[PDB]
Every structure is written in C-alpha cells, then in structure tokens.
C-alpha cells in the first residue's frame, strides 16, 4: 500500500482479530437483549441496556475496520461465532456474564496495545487509548456497580429485585 | 492591625480553631462520599449527598478565614487530621456518624458564640448566628429525619432499604 | 474488587500518595490567598489568583480519588500537613514559592506516570497525561512569565511593582 | 406615646446623640469631597469616594430618626458642628482621618448597642447589628486596605501615588 508506514504485520493481524472479537461481543449482547424481551422474562429496560451495549460494540468493530484502511492494512473478516447461550437465566446472571465479557475484551485491547507499543507505533497506541481503553474501564465500573446493587436486592426477593432494578436503575 | 477594634484574642483564637474543625468535617464527608462510590458499595446518591456536605463545610471554613481578616485578626492554619475511618460500613452507620459530627460542630459554634457574647462582640455573635448556627440546626433536623426513614426500611431488608432510600430520598 | 484489572498495587499506592500531595498544595495556596487579603497586605488580585490555584489543586485531588474508585483501587486518606509558612513576605516571594511548589508536584506526577508505564498500564498513563501533566507545564510557564514581569518592576520600586502588577497582570 | 413599649429613656437619648454623630460624619466627608474637587488638588475619584461616604452617613442618620419614631421615642435635633479642618492635606492624610472617624463612629454604635443590651431591648440590638455594625466593619476593612495600598505607592512618589490610586483603585 502506498499509504503504509510504520505499520507492522502483527498490528495489522491483531486488528483483524479484534474486530471479530467486537462483532462476537455485539452478538452476545443482542442475544441478551432478545432474551429480556421474551414474554416470559419481560424486563424491557434490561433489554434496552443490552441493546445499547450491542450497538456500541458494533460501532467499535466498524471503527477498527476503518482504522485498518487508514493505515494501509487489509481487512480480513472471519465468521462470527454465535453466543455461548440462548437462555440467560436472569438479570443478575446476565450482568455477571457481561462483566466477564467486558474484561476479556479489555484484556484483548490491552494485549493489542502492548503489540503496538513493542513495535513503536505511537499512532496506534494513541488510537487504542481513546476511546477504546477508556470506554472499557468506564463500562466495567458501571457493570460492577450494577451487579452490586442488584445483589443487594436479590437477597430479599429476586422477583422484586429484577422488577425494581429494571425500573429504577435501568429506567 | 490598624483595622482591629473590639476583637478579643480569645475570639481570634477560637476562630482559628473552628476553621480547622470545619476542614476536618469536610474531609470526613469527602471520605464518606468516596466510600459510597466504591464498586462494592455503589450508592451514588449517598455519595452525592456527602459530597455536597463536604463542599458546604469547606466553604464555611473559608468564610471564617475571611471573617478573621475582616476583623484584623491573623489566620493560623493547622494540619487537618484524616477521618477516623476509611470504611463507613453502610448508609445507616454513615448517616448516624454524620449526625454525631454535626452536633459536635454545632457545639463548637455555640461555644465560640458564648465567647463572643462574653467579650461583648455583637458583630461576631451576629456573624455566627446566620448562617452558621441556622444551617447547623437545619442540617441536624434533616439528618435526624433521614435516619428515622432509613431505620424504618432497615427493619424489613437493609439491602433493599439502602437501594430504595438512595433512589427516593437522596435522588 | 470485581472491577480491578491490570491495576498494580504500586500504582494504587502512588495514587493515594498523590491525592495527599494535591490537598497539601491546595492548602498552601489557600494560605497564600488569605495572606494577600490581610489589611496590611491588601493585594486582592494576588489573593484571587492563589484562591483559584487552590480550588484547581483541590479538584485534581478529587478526580484522582474518583480514578482510584474507577479502577477498583481503595482510597486511603492521610492527614494534610499545614503550609510551611503563615506569612508569605510579598508578591514576588509568593510567586517564587508557587513555582517551586508546581515543579515538585509536576515531578510527583512524572514519577507516578513512570510507575504506570513500567507496569504497562496505558489507561493510567493516558489519564495522567491529560489534563494533569498538561496543566502542570502550562501553569509552570505562566508562573515563570509572572515572576519575570514582576522582577522587572521590582528593580524600580517594590511597592509600586506589586500595586501595578496586581492591577494590570492579575486584574 | 401609645406605641412605646420596652423602650428605655437611655436608649432614646443615645439614639438622638448618635444621629448627630452621623450628621457630623456626613459633614466631614462632604468637606473632604469638596477639597478634592479643588483645581489645585484635582483628584475626582477621591472626591467621588468621599461624596459617597457622605451620603451613606446621611442616610444612616435618617434611618435612626425613623427608628426613634417607630419606637415611640421623640427626636431632638442638635446643631451640627463643622469639620475640624477645611484643608485635608492630601489623599493619604484624608484616608487616615476617615479611618479614625469610622472607628469613633463604630465605638459609638457599640456603646449604644451595649446600652440596649443592658436594658434588654432585643429589637434595638437587632436593629443596630444590621446594617449599622456590619457596614462599619466592612468600611473599616476597606479603608485599611486603601491606606496600605496608597502607602506602598507613597514611598516611591506621592505625586504619582495619588494620581495612580485615584485612577486604579478609586476609578
């Protein structure tokens, strides 16, 4: 590419691997959103929350593809594996799964950042820091807070816990 | 000081002692605010409430310093002792601690007022009455009310108590 | 903490040490502001300037506490040592002291940044760079400029120097 | 008087004595204002400043007369002695004289307040506290500040001192 400069093959490859990860996360959130809209689950604000997370992950994936093109790298798309589950049990289990998902995506971004740093690519480390790394920790803190609040309510009554949380925290 | 008139040394000293007390209270509230923002506590409106109390105590301290200068007294700042605890247990314990703190600060203001009265300084007694003494009793009444409401909820479920109070009273 | 990830103990500790430093700086500036409001000093714009510096240092301290919570670290507050002096001599001596203070705080931020870099924490190095490190150098340059201008005037008449500078540069 | 209640003869008399004092102060300030408007003095902002002080003292005198009537006391006006000087030397000497005048008026208000307190008249002590006692200390602090600033300039050149102060502080 006539545009390529100081762009290492490992960074190009890591980038392609990361967009797949982001699409997979988006897909997991979409599954969760759909689950909460089921007539036998009916937690509309949990659904809304996960739907928003889904769209955010999707937009990140698209921005990474755009970054690949900007640097003169070549995009290679892979199949997107379906979520690990189709039933997410309940609001608390879904939140806990999301925290685990967010931390694995954060680790992937940190690993990619380390590759860019090792290859001395300041443009890429800068790109990864904001907003990718920053949004990750913000989301992780938010999910941790949510889990704590829901757990407090859970100890009294799980049925009422989900209903009240859906209304007061997610509404 | 060319400006000094009817300003007794004991009032000057009491004033310096009181600004330290006010800074210490501010610091205690800041500690509480930070505690409620912890991911494992997550009561944002309790945090907000204590953050506001912190700023109010800080502004009072600054107004007392300003009063010292106005009367021709000389400000002497002392080290600000850290809060007695770093962990505040829960919303109810924090509220009860704040009531105790507010009453000790109120007593200090009453003692200072008595010194000013004894020395026949009507400018200072007037200054202390509004808004210092008035805000103290208003805050004390507010905290007493809060404690009563939270205790009512506590008897059912502490987890749900803090969650509901954080949302409905402090939100 | 369920939220903690890639957050080293040394960074957590350095953070707690830095908030204390920031509170101490705020306290030093407050002392200076109060000194310039004395009837026998009477340089209102110097007071205003240091009052603003005080509030800025305080807000930085609070943002660092907030950052600690975001990463899953635990805040530990220590006593805030009183300023080294209660009398700041004059406008020039105060400015020179502030430059020295700013450079020591800058060094602390640089040392903390180095710890974060050593531990491979890109989220923290990024956080420290803007606005902390950037504001430091901006403030340092501003103070250096002020000192130079005041020194030019000082050589003629210190009394007139402070009066004119208070009005034209700080006003 | 059908309206009189808890109004002691000594308070009534002190009130009449104080309105005369206030008229005399107003007259002194008027003399100063006129002096600074002389073609051979020509400090328009010093004149403006003293003119304002004159009007303030006059309005206080009128409010005290009004208070006398409100309580059922009877107003007795006495001759207003002319100022002690017709020539006020310079801006610094005038400022120093005003500080001395303000402190003597403040003492008179404090003495009157003490009489009201001794006679258990809370309506009168309250009336005297705001705005009379409060304005006195504010004015005293302001004059002390002004004197300090002008003295700083005086040490360099008195001619330039008055000119610059007239423009920058009083303008």
Swiss-Prot record, chains A, B, C, D:
Metal-binding keyword on record: yes
Residues binding Fe cation 2: 57
InterPro entries: Ferritin, Ferritin-like, Ferritin-like_diiron, Ferritin-like_SF, Ferritin_CS, Ferritin_DPS_dom
Domain of life: Eukaryota
Entry-linked SUPFAM superfamilies: Ferritin-like (SSF47240)
Cellular component annotations (GO), alphabetically ordered: cytoplasm
Residues annotated as binding Fe cation 1: 57, 60
Domain Ferritin-like diiron: 5-154
GO biological process: intracellular iron ion homeostasis; iron ion transport
CDD domains linked: Euk_Ferritin
GO molecular function (one): ferric iron binding
Keywords associated with the record: Iron, Iron storage, Metal-binding
Presence of the UniProt keyword rRNA-binding in the record: no
Family label: Belongs to the ferritin family.
Function description: Stores iron in a soluble, non-toxic, readily available form. Important for iron homeostasis. Iron is taken up in the ferrous form and deposited as ferric hydroxides after oxidation.
Subunit structure of this chain's protein: Oligomer of 24 subunits. The functional molecule is roughly spherical and contains a central cavity into which the polymeric mineral iron core is deposited.
Additional record remark: There are three types of ferritin subunits in amphibia: L, M and H chains. M and H chains are fast mineralizing; the L chain is very slow mineralizing.
UniProt name for this protein: Ferritin, lower subunit
Species classification: Eukaryota, Metazoa, Chordata, Craniata, Vertebrata
